[PDB]
Short mmCIF file of N, CA and C in Angstrom, two decimals:
data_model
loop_
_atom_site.label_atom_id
_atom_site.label_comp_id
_atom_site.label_asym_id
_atom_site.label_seq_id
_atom_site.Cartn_x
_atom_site.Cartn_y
_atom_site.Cartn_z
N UNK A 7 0.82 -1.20 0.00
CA UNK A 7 0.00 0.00 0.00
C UNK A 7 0.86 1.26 0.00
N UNK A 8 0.54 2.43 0.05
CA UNK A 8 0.88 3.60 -0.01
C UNK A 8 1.67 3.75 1.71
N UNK A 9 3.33 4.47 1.14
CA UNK A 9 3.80 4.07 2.24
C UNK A 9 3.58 4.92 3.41
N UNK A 10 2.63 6.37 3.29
CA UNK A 10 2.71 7.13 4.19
C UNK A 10 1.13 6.53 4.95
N UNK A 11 0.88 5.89 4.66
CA UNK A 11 -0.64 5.46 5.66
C UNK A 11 -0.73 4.46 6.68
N UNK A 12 -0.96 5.20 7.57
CA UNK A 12 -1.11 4.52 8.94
C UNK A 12 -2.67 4.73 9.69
N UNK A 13 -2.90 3.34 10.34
CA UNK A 13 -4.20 3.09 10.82
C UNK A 13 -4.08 3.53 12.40
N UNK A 14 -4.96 4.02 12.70
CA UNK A 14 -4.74 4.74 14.35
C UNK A 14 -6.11 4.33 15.04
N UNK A 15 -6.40 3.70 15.99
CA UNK A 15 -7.25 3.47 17.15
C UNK A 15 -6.99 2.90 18.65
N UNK A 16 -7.71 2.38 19.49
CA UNK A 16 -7.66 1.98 20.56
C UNK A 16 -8.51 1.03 21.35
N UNK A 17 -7.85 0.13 21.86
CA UNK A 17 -8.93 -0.90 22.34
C UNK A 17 -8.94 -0.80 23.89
N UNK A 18 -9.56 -1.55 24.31
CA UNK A 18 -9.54 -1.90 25.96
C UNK A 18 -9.03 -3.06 26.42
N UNK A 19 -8.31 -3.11 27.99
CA UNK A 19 -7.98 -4.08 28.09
C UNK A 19 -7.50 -3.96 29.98
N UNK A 20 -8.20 -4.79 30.51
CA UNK A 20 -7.97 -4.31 32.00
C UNK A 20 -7.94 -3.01 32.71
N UNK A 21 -9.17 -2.07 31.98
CA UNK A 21 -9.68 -1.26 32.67
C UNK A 21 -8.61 0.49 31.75
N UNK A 22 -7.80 -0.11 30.79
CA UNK A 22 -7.00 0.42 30.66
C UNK A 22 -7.04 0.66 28.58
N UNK A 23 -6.41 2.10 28.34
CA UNK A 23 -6.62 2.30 26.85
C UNK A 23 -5.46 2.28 26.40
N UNK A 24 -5.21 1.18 25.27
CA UNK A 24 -4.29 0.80 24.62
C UNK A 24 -4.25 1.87 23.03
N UNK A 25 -3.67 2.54 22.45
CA UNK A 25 -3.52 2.68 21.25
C UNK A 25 -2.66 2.48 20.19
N UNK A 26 -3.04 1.93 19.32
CA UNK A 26 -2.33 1.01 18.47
C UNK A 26 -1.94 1.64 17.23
N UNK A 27 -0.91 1.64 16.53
CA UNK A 27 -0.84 2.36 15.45
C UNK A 27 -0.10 1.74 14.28
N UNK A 28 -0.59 1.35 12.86
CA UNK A 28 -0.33 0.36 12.29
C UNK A 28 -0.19 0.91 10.92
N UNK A 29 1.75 0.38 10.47
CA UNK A 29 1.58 0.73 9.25
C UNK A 29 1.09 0.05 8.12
N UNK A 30 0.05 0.69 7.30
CA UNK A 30 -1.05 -0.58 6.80
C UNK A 30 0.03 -1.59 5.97
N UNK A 31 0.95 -1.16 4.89
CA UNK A 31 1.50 -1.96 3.70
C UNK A 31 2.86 -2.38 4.44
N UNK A 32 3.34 -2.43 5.86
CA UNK A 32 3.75 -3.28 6.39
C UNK A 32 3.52 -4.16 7.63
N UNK A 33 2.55 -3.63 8.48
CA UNK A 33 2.14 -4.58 9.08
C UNK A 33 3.29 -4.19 10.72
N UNK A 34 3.80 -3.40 10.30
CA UNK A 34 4.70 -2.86 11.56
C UNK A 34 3.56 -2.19 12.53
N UNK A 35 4.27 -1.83 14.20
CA UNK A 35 2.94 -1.42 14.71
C UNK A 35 3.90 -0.66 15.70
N UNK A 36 3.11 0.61 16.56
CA UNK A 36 3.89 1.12 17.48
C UNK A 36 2.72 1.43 18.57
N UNK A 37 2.43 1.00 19.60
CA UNK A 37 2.00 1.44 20.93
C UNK A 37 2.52 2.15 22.02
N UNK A 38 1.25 2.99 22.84
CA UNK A 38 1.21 3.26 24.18
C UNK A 38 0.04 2.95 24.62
N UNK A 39 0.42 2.95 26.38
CA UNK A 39 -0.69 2.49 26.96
C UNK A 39 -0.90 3.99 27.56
N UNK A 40 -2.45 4.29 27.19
CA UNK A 40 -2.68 5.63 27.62
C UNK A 40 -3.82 6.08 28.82
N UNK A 41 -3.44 7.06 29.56
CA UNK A 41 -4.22 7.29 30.77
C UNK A 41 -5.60 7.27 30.05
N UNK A 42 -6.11 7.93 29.51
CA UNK A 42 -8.03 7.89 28.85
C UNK A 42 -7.68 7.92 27.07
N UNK A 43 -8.62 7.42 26.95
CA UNK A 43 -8.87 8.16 25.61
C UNK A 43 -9.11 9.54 25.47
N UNK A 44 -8.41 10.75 25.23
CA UNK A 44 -8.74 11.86 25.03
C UNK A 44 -8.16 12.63 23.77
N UNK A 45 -8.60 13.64 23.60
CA UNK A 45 -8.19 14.59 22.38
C UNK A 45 -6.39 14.82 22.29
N UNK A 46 -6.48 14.80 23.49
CA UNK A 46 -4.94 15.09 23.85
C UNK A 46 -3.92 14.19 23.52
N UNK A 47 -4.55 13.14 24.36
CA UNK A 47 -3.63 11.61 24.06
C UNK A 47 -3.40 11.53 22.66
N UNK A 48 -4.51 11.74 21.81
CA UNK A 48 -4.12 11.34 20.41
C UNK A 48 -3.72 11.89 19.54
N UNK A 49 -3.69 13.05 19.86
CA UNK A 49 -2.85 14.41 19.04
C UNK A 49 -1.30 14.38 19.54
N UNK A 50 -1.35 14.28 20.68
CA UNK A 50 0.37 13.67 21.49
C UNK A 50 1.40 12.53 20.29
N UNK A 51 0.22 11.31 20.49
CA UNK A 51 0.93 10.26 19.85
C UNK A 51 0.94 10.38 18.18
N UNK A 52 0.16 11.13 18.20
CA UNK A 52 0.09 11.43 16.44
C UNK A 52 1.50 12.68 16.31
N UNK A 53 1.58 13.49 17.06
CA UNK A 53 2.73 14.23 16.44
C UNK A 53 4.43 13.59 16.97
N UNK A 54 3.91 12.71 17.94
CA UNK A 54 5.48 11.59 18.28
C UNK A 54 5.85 10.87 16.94
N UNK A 55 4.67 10.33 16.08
CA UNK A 55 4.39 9.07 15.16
C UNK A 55 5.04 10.18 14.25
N UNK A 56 4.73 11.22 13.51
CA UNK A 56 5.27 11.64 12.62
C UNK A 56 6.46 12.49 12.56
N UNK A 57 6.96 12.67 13.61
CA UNK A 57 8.58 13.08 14.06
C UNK A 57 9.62 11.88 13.78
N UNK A 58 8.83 10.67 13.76
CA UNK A 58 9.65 9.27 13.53
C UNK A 58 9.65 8.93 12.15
N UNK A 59 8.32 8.60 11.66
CA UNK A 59 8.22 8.13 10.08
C UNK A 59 7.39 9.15 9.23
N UNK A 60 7.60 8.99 7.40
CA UNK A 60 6.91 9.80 7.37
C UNK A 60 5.36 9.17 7.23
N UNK A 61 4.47 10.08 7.95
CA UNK A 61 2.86 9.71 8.29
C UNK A 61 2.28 10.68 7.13
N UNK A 62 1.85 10.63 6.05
CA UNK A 62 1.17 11.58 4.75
C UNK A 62 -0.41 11.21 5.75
N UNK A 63 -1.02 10.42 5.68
CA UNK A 63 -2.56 10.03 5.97
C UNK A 63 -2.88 8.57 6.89
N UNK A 64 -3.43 9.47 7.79
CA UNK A 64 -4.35 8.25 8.59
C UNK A 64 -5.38 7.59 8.76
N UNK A 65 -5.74 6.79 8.96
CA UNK A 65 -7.42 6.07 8.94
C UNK A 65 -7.55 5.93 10.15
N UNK A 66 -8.83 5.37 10.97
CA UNK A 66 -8.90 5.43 11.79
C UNK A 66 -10.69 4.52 11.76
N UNK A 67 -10.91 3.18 12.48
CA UNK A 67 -12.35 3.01 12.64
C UNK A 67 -13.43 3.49 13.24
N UNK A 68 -12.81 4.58 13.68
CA UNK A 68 -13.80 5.55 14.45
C UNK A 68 -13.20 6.61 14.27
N UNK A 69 -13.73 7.00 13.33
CA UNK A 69 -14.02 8.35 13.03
C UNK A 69 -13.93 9.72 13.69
N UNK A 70 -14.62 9.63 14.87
CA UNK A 70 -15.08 10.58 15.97
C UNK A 70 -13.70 10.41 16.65
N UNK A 71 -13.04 9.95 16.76
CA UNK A 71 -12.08 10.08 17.86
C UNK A 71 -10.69 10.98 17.03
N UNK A 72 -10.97 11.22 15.66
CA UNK A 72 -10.31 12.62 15.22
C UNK A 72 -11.04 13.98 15.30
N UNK A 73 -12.26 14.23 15.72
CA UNK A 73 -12.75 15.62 15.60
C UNK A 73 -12.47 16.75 16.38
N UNK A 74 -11.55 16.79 17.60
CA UNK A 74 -11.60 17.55 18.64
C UNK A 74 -10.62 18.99 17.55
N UNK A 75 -10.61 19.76 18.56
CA UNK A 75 -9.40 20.38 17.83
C UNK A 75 -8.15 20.49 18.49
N UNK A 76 -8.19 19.92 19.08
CA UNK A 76 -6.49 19.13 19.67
C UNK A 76 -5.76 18.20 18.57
N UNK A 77 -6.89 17.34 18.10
CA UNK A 77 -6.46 16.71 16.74
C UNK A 77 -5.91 16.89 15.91
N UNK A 78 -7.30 17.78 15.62
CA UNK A 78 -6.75 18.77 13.95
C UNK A 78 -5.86 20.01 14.26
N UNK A 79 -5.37 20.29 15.29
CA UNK A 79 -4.44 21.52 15.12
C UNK A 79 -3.06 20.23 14.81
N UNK A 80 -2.65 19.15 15.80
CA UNK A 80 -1.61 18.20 15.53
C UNK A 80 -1.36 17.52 13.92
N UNK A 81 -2.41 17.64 13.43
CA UNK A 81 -2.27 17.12 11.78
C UNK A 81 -2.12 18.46 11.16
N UNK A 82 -3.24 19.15 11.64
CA UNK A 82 -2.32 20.59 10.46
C UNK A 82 -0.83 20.87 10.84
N UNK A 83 -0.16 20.66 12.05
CA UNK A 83 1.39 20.94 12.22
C UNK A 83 2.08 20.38 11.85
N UNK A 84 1.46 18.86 11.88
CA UNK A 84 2.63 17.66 10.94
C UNK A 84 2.25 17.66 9.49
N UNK A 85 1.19 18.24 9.04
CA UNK A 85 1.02 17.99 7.37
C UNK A 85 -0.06 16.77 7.53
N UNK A 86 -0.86 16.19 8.14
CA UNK A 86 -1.33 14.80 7.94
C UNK A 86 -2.73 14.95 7.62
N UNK A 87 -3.23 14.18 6.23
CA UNK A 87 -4.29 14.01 6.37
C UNK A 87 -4.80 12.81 6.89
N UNK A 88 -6.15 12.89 6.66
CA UNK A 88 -7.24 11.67 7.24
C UNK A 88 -7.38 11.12 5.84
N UNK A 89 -6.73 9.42 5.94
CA UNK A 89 -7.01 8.74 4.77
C UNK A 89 -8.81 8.21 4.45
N UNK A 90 -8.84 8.90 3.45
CA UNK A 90 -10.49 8.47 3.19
C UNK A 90 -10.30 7.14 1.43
N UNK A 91 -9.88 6.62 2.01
CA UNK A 91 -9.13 5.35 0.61
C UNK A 91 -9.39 4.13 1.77
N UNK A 100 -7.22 -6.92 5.02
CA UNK A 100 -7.22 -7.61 6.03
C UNK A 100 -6.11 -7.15 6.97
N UNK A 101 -4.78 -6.54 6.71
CA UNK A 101 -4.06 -6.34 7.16
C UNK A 101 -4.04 -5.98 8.64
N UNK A 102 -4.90 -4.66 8.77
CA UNK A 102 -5.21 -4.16 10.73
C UNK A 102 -6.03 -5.11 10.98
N UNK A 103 -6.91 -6.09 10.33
CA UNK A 103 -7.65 -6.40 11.55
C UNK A 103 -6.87 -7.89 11.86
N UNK A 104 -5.83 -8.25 11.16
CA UNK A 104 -4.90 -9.44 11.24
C UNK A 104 -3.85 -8.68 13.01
N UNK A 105 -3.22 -7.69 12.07
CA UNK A 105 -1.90 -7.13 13.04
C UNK A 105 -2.91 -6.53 14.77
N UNK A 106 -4.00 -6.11 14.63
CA UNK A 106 -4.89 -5.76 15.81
C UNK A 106 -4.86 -7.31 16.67
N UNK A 107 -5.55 -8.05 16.06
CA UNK A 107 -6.09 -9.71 16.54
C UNK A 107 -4.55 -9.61 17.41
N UNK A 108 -3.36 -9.94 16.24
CA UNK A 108 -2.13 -10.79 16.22
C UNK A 108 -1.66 -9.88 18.30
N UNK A 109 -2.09 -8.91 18.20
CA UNK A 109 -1.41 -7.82 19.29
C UNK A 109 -2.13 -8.26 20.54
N UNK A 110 -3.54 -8.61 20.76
CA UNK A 110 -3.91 -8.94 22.04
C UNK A 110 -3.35 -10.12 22.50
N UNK A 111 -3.20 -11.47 21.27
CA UNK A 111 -3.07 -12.58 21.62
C UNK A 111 -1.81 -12.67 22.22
N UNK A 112 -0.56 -11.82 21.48
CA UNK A 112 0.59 -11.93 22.21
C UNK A 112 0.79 -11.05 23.73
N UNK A 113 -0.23 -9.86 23.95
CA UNK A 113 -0.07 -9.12 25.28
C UNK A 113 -0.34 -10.88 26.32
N UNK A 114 -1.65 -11.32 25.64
CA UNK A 114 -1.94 -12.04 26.74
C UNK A 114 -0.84 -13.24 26.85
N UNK A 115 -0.11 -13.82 25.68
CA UNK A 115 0.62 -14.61 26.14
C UNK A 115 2.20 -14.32 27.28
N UNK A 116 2.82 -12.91 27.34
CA UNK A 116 3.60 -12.58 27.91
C UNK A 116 3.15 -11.63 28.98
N UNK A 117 1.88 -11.99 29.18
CA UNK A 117 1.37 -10.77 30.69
C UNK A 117 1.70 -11.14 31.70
N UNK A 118 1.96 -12.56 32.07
CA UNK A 118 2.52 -12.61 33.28
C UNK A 118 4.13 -12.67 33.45
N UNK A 119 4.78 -11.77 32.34
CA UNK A 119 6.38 -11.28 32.26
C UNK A 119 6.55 -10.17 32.82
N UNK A 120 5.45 -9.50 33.25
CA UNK A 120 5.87 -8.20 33.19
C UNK A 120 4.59 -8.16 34.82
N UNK A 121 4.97 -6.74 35.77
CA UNK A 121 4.16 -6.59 36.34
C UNK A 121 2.53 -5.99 36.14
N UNK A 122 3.67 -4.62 34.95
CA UNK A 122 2.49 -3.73 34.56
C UNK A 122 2.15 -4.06 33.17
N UNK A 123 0.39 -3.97 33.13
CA UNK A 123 0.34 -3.85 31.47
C UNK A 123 0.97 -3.25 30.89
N UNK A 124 1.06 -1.97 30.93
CA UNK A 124 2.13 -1.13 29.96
C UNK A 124 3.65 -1.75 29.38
N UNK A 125 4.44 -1.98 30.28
CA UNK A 125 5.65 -3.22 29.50
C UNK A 125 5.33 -4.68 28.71
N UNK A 126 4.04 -5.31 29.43
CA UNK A 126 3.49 -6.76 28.81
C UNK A 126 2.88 -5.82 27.39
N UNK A 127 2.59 -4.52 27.10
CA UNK A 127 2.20 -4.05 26.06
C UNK A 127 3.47 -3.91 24.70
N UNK A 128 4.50 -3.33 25.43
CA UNK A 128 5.81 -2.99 24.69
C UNK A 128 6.69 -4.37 24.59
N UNK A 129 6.05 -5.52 24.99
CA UNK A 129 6.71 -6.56 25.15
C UNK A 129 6.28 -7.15 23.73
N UNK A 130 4.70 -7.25 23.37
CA UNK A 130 4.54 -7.23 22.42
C UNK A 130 4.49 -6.91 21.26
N UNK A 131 4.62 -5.59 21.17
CA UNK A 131 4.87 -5.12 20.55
C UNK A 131 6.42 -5.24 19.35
N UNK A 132 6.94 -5.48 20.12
CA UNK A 132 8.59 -5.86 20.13
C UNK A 132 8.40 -7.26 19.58
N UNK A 133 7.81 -8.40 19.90
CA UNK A 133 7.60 -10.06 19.73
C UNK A 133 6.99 -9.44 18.27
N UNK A 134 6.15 -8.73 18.19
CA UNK A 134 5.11 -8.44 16.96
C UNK A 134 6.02 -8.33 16.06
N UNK A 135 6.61 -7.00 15.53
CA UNK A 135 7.63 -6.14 14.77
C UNK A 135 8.71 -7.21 14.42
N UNK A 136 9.03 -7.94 15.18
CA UNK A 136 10.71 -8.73 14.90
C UNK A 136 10.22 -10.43 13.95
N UNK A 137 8.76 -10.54 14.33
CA UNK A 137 8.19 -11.95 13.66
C UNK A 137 8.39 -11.81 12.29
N UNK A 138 9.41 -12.83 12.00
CA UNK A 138 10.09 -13.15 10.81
C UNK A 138 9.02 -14.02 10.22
N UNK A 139 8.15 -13.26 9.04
CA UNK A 139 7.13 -14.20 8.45
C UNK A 139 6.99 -14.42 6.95
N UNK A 140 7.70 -15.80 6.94
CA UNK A 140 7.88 -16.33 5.57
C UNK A 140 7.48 -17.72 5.96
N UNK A 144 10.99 -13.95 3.94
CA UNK A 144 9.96 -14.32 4.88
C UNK A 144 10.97 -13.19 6.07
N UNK A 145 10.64 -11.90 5.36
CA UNK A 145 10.68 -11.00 6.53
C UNK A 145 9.56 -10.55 7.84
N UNK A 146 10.15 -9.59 8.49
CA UNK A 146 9.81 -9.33 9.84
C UNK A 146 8.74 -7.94 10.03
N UNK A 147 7.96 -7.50 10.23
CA UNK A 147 7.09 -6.19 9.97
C UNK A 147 7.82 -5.18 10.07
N UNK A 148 8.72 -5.06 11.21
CA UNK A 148 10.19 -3.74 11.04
C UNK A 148 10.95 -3.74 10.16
N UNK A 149 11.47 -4.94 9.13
CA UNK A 149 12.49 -5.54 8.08
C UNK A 149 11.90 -4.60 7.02
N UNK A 150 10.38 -4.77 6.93
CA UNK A 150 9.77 -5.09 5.73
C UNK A 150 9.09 -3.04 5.92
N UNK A 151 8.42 -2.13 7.22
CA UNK A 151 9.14 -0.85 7.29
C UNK A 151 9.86 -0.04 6.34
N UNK A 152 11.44 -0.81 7.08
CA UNK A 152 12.45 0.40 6.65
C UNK A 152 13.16 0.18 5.41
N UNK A 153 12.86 -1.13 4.86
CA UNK A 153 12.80 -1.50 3.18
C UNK A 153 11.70 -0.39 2.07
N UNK A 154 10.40 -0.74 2.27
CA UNK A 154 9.79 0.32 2.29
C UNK A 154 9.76 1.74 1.92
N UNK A 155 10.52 2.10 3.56
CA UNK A 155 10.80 3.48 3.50
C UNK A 155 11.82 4.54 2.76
N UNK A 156 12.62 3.10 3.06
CA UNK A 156 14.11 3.30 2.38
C UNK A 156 14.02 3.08 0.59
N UNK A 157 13.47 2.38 0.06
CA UNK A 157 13.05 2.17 -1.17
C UNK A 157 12.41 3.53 -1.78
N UNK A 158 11.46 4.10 -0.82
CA UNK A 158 10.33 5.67 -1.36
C UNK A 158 11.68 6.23 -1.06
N UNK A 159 12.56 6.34 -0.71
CA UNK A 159 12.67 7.60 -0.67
C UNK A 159 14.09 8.07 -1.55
N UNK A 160 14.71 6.72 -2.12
CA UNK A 160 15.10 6.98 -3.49
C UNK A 160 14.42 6.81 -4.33
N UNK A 161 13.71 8.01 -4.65
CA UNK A 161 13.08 8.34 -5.72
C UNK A 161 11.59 7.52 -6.24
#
């Protein structure tokens, strides 16, 4: 897929909001575990996300959780639009199953979160890895 698009939402999970952020045409993913869902939180992690890679357009399955204007002032500063064009709901699934298999590694969700995250990104699947397959990608767009 188009390499600047990334999928952005959040699930629940022990009382607690996970947000997940997924690059669609690799399957790479980057989390935090966040105090609420708020305008703030997601304008935060949206202008961290595009200080790192470049982010052109995001999607998102809920809609509503871009309207505040905490949002949209963070996408007008980074340049980002809202992409309106199986992969997330594979790499979403693939992310709970591994929190839950390494939750009792860690005390706090938040590390059993980054634990997975990490197991996720490095799964060599052939037959590269979702980080391999990234900065190939990235590195490929951006000669030319």
């Amino acid at each position: 897929c188009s390499p600047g698009i990334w999928q952005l939402d959040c699930t629940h999970l022990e009382g607690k909001v996970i947000l997940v952020a997924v690059h669609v045409a690799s399957g790479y993913i980057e989390a935090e575990v966040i105090p609420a869902e708020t305008g703030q939180e997601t304008a935060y992690f949206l202008l961290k996300l595009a200080g790192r890679w470049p982010v052109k357009t995001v999607h998102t399955d809920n809609g509503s959780n871009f309207t505040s204007t905490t949002v949209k002032a963070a996408c007008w500063w980074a340049g980002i639009k809202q992409e309106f064009g199986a992969v997330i709901e594979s790499m979403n699934k693939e992310l709970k199953k591994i929190i839950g298999q390494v939750r009792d590694q860690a005390e706090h969700l938040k590390t059993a979160v980054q634990m997975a995250v990490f197991i996720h990104n490095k799964k060599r699947k052939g037959g590269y890895s979702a980080g391999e397959r990234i900065v190939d990608i990235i590195a490929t767009d951006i000669q030319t």
